[PDB]
Write a protein that binds this ligand. Structure first.
Ligand SMILES: COc1cccc(CN(CCN(CC(=O)O)Cc2ccccc2SC)CC(=O)O)c1O
Ligand SMILES: [Cl-]
Ligand SMILES: [Cl-]
Ligand SMILES: [Cl-]
Ligand SMILES: [Fe+3]
Length: 498
């Protein structure tokens, strides 16, 4: 049928517990579960499950007036008690949500009536509404589907208020969603969506070519980029490449030799020809990045000075810091110690491996010996959390996370950014200012704090920005134009109209 589509994802969507993370997939949680307020491309939120709201003068007490016509997909009512119970269930697992500062800011949540929901905060937390709008954890499952009045230990059926319902799941095979015929809002034109589980990018491309699937939708890893380019010229297909959504970069460990030295990090930031990397490894499909955040990101248009590709300058910086070349050797030494840096990445990720090889080659040209450490995903994440890396591939989070939530998370010791920044003398000052910028409502001070944080991170060369990457699409032409969601990690299936 023309109102049924088949697409793909590298893994299953997961159990669709609205309040937990891996192996739950965010786009799928957002298909079934809904927020109080909904994020818009212009950075604002609109009323959603909450039709209106007010707050006290000190900005600590918030009162939401909820819709009274919304039902969970199983018929049960959505009301303020249901919402309040969801906030309780999330915060009963509060430690797990440390990365998201709203989870530490919420003091109290209670239903004042069927339609009035009161939320109290520790402080006037300015990104309050934006974080309520995220795919997780603050979305709502039917309280009847709690397990012993909790969700942190599992749920029963994944019953949301959203436009899609999970029909069935087969582990390592597929997931099937259908349209919610009792949805409170606009009904999707598509009636059924099947997700084929296809972990390999080449196999996803082949699946599209043979006609097994109708739609591919994802970031730069969706399919081989040379294949994507070929597809974009093939009149039998339709392809799309969005405007950039987030940054891909290296994080450099300021607490580990030799990346503990500023001169070394500065030299590394001059050593990479990013334009050539992109044209060589990314088939020319992405944009060069000079800064942690693109100048188009809120609060990030700061006139930060780019470190352009300049091997001569990279060498000079290293020479001045005492890293010089021994007779008949291409790798620099200082105090007998070679300039050796470990670059860790997911070993089975062909794109990461390709970029890593380019980075290694470019840095060898200025006398730095980069050793490639390709490992399984679990081992790489363990390295991120504990700072067992010299350089590591990393990325920002896209809207609405960038920049406030990404910066917020830099304070959390179990994250790559904290670890990479751990060796900076100004790290406590940075973490203090990150705390302040989230709670300030002096707009002038807020901009000044973002400027100081991002400028320190830039001047200290904590990162090696590589690319601003885009969303891409491959689809059967009959599906028409495929729209993008304001939230970079969501997929607007309900907006597709064949
Ligand atoms: C595509 O994945 C993301 C897209 C945009 C933002 C994030 C950041 N996540 C931050 C929290 N995760 C950790 C991380 O991505 O660094 C998930 C998480 C939270 C608490 C405990 C464990 C984990 S997975 C290690 C948001 C989320 O997953 O809901 C993403 O992981
Ligand atoms: Cl989890
Ligand atoms: Cl995952
Ligand atoms: Cl139970
Ligand atoms: Fe995450």
């Amino acid at each position: 049928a023309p109102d049924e589509i088949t697409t793909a994802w590298p893994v299953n969507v997961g159990p669709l517990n609205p309040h937990l993370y891996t192996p739950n997939q965010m786009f799928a949680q957002s298909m079934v579960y809904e927020p109080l307020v909904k994020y818009q491309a212009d950075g604002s939120v609109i009323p959603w499950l909450a039709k209106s709201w007010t707050h006290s003068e000190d900005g600590k007490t918030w009162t939401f007036t909820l819709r009274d016509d919304v039902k969970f997909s199983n018929g049960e009512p959505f009301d303020a008690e249901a919402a309040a119970e969801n906030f309780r269930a999330v915060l009963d697992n509060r430690q797990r949500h440390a990365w998201l500062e709203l989870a530490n800011q919420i003091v109290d949540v209670k239903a004042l009536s069927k339609t009035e929901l009161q939320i109290t905060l520790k402080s006037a937390y300015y990104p309050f509404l934006q974080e309520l709008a995220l795919p997780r954890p603050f979305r709502f499952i039917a309280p009847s589907q709690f397990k012993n009045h909790e969700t942190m230990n599992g749920i029963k059926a994944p019953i949301g208020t959203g436009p899609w319902i999970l029909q069935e799941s087969k582990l390592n095979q597929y997931d099937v969603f259908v349209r919610n015929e009792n949805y409170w809002g606009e009904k999707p034109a598509i009636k059924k969506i099947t997700f084929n589980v296809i972990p390999d990018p080449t196999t996803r491309a082949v699946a599209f070519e043979t006609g097994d699937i109708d739609l591919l939708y994802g970031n730069e890893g969706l399919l081989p980029l040379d294949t994507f380019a070929r597809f974009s010229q093939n009149p039998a297909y339709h392809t799309q490449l969005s405007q950039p959504i987030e940054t891909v970069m290296l994080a450099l460990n300021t607490a580990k030799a030799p990346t503990n030295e500023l001169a070394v990090r500065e030299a590394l930031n001059y050593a990479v020809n990013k334009k050539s990397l992109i044209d060589n490894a990314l088939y020319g499909t992405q944009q060069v990045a000079d800064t942690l955040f693109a100048p188009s990101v809120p609060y990030a248009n700061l006139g930060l000075k780019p470190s352009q590709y300049d091997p001569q300058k990279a060498k000079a910086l290293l020479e001045k810091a005492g890293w010089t070349l021994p007779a008949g050797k291409d790798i620099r030494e200082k105090n007998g110690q070679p300039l050796r840096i470990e670059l860790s990445f997911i070993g089975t990720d062909a794109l990461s491996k390709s970029m890593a090889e380019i980075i290694q080659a470019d840095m060898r040209q200025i006398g730095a010996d980069v050793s490639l450490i390709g490992e399984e995903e679990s081992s790489i994440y363990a390295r991120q959390r504990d700072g067992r890396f010299g350089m590591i591939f990393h990325r920002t989070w896209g809207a609405p996370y960038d920049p406030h939530a990404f910066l917020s998370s830099m304070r959390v010791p179990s994250h790559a950014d904290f670890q990479a920044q751990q060796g900076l003398a100004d790290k406590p000052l940075i973490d203090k200012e990150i705390g302040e910028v989230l709670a300030t409502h002096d707009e002038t001070q807020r901009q000044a704090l973002y400027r100081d944080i991002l400028t320190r991170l830039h001047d200290e060369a904590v990162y090696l920005p590589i690319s601003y990457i885009s969303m891409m699409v491959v689809s059967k032409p009959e599906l028409g134009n495929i729209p993008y969601a304001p939230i970079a990690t969501e997929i607007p299936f309900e907006q597709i109209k064949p």
